[PDB]
Amino acid sequence: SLNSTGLAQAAINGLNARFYESSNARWSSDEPWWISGVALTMVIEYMRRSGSKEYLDQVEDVIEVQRQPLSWWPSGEGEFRADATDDTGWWALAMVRMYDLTGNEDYLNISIKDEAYMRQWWTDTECGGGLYVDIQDLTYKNAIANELYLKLVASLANRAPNATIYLDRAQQAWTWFLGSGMINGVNLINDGLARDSNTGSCYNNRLPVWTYNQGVILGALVELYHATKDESYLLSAQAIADAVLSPSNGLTSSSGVLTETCEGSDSCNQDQQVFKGVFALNLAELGDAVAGASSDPDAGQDYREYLDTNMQSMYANDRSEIVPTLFDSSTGDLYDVSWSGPFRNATMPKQASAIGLYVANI
Numbered sequence: 001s002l003n004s005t006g007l008a009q010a011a012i013n014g015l016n017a018r019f020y021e022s023s024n025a026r027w028s029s030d031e032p033w034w035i036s037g038v039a040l041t042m043v044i045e046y047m048r049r050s051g052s053k054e055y056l057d058q059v060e061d062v063i064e065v066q067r068q069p070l071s072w073w074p075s076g077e078g079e080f081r082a083d084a085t086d087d088t089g090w091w092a093l094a095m096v097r098m099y100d101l102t103g104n105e106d107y108l109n110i111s112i113k114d115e116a117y118m119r120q121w122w123t124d125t126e127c128g129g130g131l132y133v134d135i136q137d138l139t140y141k142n143a144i145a146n147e148l149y150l151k152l153v154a155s156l157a158n159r160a161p162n163a164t165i166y167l168d169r170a171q172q173a174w175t176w177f178l179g180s181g182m183i184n185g186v187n188l189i190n191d192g193l194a195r196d197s198n199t200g201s202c203y204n205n206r207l208p209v210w211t212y213n214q215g216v217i218l219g220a221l222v223e224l225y226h227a228t229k230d231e232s233y234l235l236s237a238q239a240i241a242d243a244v245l246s247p248s249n250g251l252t253s254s255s256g257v258l259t260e261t262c263e264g265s266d267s268c269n270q271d272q273q274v275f276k277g278v279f280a281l282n283l284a285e286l287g288d289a290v291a292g293a294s295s296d297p298d299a300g301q302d303y304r305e306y307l308d309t310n311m312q313s314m315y316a317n318d319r320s321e322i323v324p325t326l327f328d329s330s331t332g333d334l335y336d337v338s339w340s341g342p343f344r345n346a347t348m349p350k351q352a353s354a355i356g357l358y359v360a361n362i
Ligand SMILES: OC[C@H]1O[C@@H](O[C@@H]2[C@@H](O)[C@H](O)O[C@H](CO)[C@H]2O)[C@H](O)[C@@H](O)[C@@H]1O
Pocket: 029, 030, 031, 032, 033, 034, 072, 083, 084
């Protein structure tokens, strides 16, 4: 009885009414730039899944301005090539989705330039593989930058003309990730890798399990399945998603609600506020891939029910409607960080995460 399409549109309208900067073609310049990339993904994915085009003009504006050489990383020469590889990876994946929505080769070309830029910081000398996140420093190979890269090459393996070298890169990247140790004993992914002071060998740094690091990897494996038709990639994704859904692992509350590890102590920073929606969108991708790979009508039904359950809780306990004024008649919905906890304030990363959950149920 809940209309996820209308709620996503209200959530996007709330996102624009409070956080979109027309003069900058960006959401919230006081927030991390990469989260504007995530927001762009959610808006593109809303249009892709709902069949609507109401934000297409706005998305094109954002792309055209955020394409330009970044003032804080001119040496990237624009096209979203930034001072960290994960920043680049978020926009690169948004361009994959833009290409999926529009069929405009221009966006596919951006993702291709991004893949080649990110790969510059893949090294086999440390950790036997993987890329660094901090381009200027080269001190950290983490989960998210390698999950983004892996989903990027796996996506390009299904879309780019030289799809073979991208499929080989994806298969090689997944083999490295699987062997990295970052996937722990309960099939959840810790934050990144530490390096042995004496031996130089790398190991799971046991930093927190963040929801978005259980998400991007699902989309990556889904694209690897589409590229190979090997259901082993789906089964591996399902083991990771199942671990998230199991309340015994602390990511899913006793009410069945996705919960970031920082929500308990009310310490979720500007980055962590956006994590849950990224997982939700990728989980919906996994659900679609699972239901299409088997003739069982109940295939992937647990993931849909999970997303549905999480939507209603967010719908009921985390929502606050904007009240219009005599000057601003904007209507929409605002959302806080906890999908079960109360609504206290809204921020752009919280709102972006909100849209992702609604879009995940379209
Ligand atoms: O990355 C998001 C934000 O980055 C800001 O640039 C930062 C530089 O000012 C600083 O010198 O180094 C960090 C390293 O990441 C840069 O991110 C932008 O000014 C912001 O607009 C952006 O939201």
